Amino acid sequence: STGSATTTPIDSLDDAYITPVQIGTPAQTLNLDFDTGSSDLWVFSSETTASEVDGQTIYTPSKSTTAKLLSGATWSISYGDGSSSSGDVYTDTVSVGGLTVTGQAVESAKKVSSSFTEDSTIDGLLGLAFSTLNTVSPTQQKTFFDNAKASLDSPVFTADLGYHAPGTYNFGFIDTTAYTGSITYTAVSTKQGFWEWTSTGYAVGSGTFKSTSIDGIADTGTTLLYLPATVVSAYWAQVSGAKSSSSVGGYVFPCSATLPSFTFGVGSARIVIPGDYIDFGPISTGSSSCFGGIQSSAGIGINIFGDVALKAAFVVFNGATTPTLGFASK
Ligand SMILES: NCc1ccc(C(F)(F)F)cc1
Ligand SMILES: NCc1ccc(C(F)(F)F)cc1
């Protein structure tokens, strides 16, 4: 079987992407943030503290005839940005773009951090990293992808994120009309539970390509591109007036500047991020200082190929017994 669903940016800056997901019987449709950097499927629900819900669509397990409470199970997650949520666990039927999994663990939020409350457009997360990172206790639960794997035509999913535009998540098949050229595959390490891979280098604008190994994770759940301080310094040095701002928390640049492109290596192939993708707009309304889409990973501890990088490519998440990542231009 296969599934295919349209994913849509939540605002004019592509801060995140939401994808409709059908949960329960009869279907309750929630718009979830597909996150290859985490492994929990959790949703705003009728159990969420009422003051922490502000416009989100909630899952109501009592109205689903297929929902079953998972006795004694709880969950608690903290994300790298300081966000967190926690609650109890149901199992229920979950469908993505026609692809149905029965008995999927649906984690019901009882408490969420303020960053989720203030994001009215995101009803939850759908984790797509490896199941070893799932936070359900005492019995760890499998991701949607892991549960669907056996029934998929091919054990893959693909991410085709749009620049200021809708895109597609496909499960079980590779749409050969969605990219140009060939797909270049590269090795994945699962030792930390992430889709972790090694980029072969980078170039700034039309500059010389620098061969250098950059270990990082492919994370649809993170907005920006987080790279080592040396790389990020070389990029912003080519932008007149750009500087690292402690009060803002990263590199900013005069909004009148034109940004150079950024190239990253995948084996012998090259993925080019257009400079316009790196502009995240004024730091505050009316400001002439703009926030950069490439930032240092030094404070984070890991390099992150977030949406800024992934939306420049067609990305194959190959969940075969030896997993690989595929990148193609589009
Ligand atoms: N998108 C989920 C996520 C959040 C944080 C991290 C970090 F910062 F720990 F690497 C990775 C993945
Ligand atoms: N990386 C996972 C993640 C995704 C979205 C959010 C936000 F923005 F909704 F709070 C936080 C963390």
Cα 183 to the center of its chain, rounded Å: 20
Exposure letters 26-53 (e unless 16+ CB within 10 A, then b):
eebebbbbbbbbbbbbbbbbebbeeebb
d(CA 274, CA 290): 17
Q: Decide whether any atom of ligand 2 lies within 6 Å of the 314 Cβ.
A: no
The CA-CA-CA angle for residues 79, 191, 84, to 5°, reads 10
d(CA 301, CA 177): 37
The atom of ligand 2 lying closest to the CA of 125 is: 4
Exposure letters 246-270 (e unless 16+ CB within 10 A, then b):
eeeebbbbeeeeebbbbbbbbeebb
Which residue has the least CA distance to atom 11 on ligand 2? 83
Q: What is the resolution of this structure in A?
A: 1.8
d(CA 130, CA 272): 28
d(CA 241, CA 272): 23
Q: Check if the beta carbon of residue 128 is closer than 8 Å to that of residue 36.
A: yes
Q: Check if the beta carbon of residue 326 is closer than 8 Å to that of residue 284.
A: no
> Solved by what technique?
X-ray
Domains of the chain, by residue range, sit at 5-174, 175-330
Question: Is 12 known to be catalytic?
Answer: no
Tokens (6 digits) for 266: 């995948």
Q: Decide whether any atom of ligand 2 lies within 6 Å of the 222 Cβ.
A: yes
The one-letter amino acid code at 65 reads T
Q: Check if the beta carbon of residue 105 is closer than 8 Å to that of residue 70.
A: yes
Which residue, among 121, 117, 97, has the nearest Cα to 54 in the 3D structure?
A: 117
Q: Decide whether any atom of ligand 2 lies within 6 Å of the 159 Cβ.
A: no
Ligand nearest to the CA of 194: 1
Torsions phi, psi of 81, nearest 5? Answer: -85, 5
Which residue has the least CA distance to atom 3 on ligand 1? 37
Ligand nearest to the CA of 112: 2
Q: How many helices (H) and strands (E) does the chain have?
A: 4, 24
**Catalytic residue (one of 33, 35, 92, 119):** 35
Q: Which of 18, 52, 112, 115 has most ligand 2 atoms within 8 Å of CB, for mutation?
A: 115
Which residue has the least CA distance to atom 11 on ligand 1? 37
Tokens (6 digits) for 4: 């295919």
Which residue has the least CA distance to atom 7 on ligand 1? 80
Which residue, among 329, 201, 186, 181, has the nearest Cα to 264 in the 3D structure?
A: 201
Residue located via tokens 């773009």: 97
Ligand nearest to the CA of 193: 1
d(CA 3, CA 32): 16
Q: What distance in angstroms lies between residue 37's CA and the mean position of ligand 1's atoms?
A: 6
- Residues near ligand 1 (Cβ within 6 A): 35, 37-38, 79-80, 219, 221-222, 300, 302, 304
Question: Is 146 known to be catalytic?
Answer: no
**Catalytic residue (one of 85, 95, 199, 297):** 199
Quick count: other Cβ atoms within 10 Å of Cβ 307?
Answer: 25
